[PDB]
């Protein structure tokens, strides 16, 4: 691929320049190159990969939401639907790229629990971004893939990580949002957030307490 002739260390170094430059597409493409070298990511490198793809997909999700809303409030001409479709298609390509990287290179039987949970959480997250724009039979397949990834990450985080670990927390947050906002299970959602928040206070004493606010903030919105 495009990055095949570049040294792993140079790709990582360039991803960090791109971050400083706020060029998140270049950041992603550099990090995709690095992963394709076939060696494990360190903790720092995983976060470069996370941050770069989150920003790309973030922008695209926000644009999709603006367009869908203009489309809802206005239906009188195909233009808004066409452009929403186009943004939707680009969003889906990015998600497919991330999921390709996770399945082809990153998700392994081997490694730190933390690393395996990280990648399975990313997989549930990027299936959930797909589910946000999906309809019909495709949506149902995507929802089941999101669920199955998150559930697998949840199994690992509970057997191998402590209740205050930010990854385990973020994972349960996102999965609860999935339950409520995507999978139409408010019961499972609310239970997961409360149980997750509860088991966290019982081990308290940072990035831990943000995610604990968010579990409560969501719970407010939901009940």
């Amino acid at each position: 691929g495009a990055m095949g002739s570049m040294e792993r260390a140079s790709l990582i170094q360039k991803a960090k320049l791109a971050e400083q430059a706020e060029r998140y597409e270049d950041m992603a493409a550099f990090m995709k190159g690095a992963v394709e070298k076939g060696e494990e990511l360190s903790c720092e490198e995983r976060n470069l990969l996370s941050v770069a793809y989150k920003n790309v997909v973030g922008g695209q999700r926000a644009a999709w939401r603006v367009l869908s809303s203009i489309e809802q409030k206005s239906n009188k001409g195909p233009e808004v639907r066409e452009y929403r479709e186009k943004v939707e298609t680009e969003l889906q390509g990015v998600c497919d790229t991330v999921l390709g990287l996770l399945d082809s290179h990153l998700i392994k039987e081997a490694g730190d629990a933390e690393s395996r949970v990280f990648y399975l959480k990313m997989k549930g997250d990027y299936y959930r971004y797909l589910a946000e724009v999906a309809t019909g039979d495709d949506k149902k397949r995507i929802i089941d893939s999101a669920r199955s990834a998150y559930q697998e990450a949840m199994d690992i985080s509970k057997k191998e990580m402590p209740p205050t670990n930010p990854i385990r927390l973020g994972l349960a947050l996102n999965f609860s949002v999935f339950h409520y906002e995507i999978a139409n299970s408010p019961e499972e959602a609310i239970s997961l957030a409360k149980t997750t928040f509860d088991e966290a206070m019982a081990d308290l004493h940072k990035d831990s307490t943000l995610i604990m606010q968010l579990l409560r903030d969501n719970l407010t919105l939901w009940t």
């Binding site: 989150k54 973030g58 949002v177 969501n218 919105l221």
Partner: peptide, 9 residues
């Protein structure tokens, strides 16, 4: 608009 982690910005 339920919040997810990590956040953007």
């Amino acid at each position: 608009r339920s919040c997810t982690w990590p956040l953007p910005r």
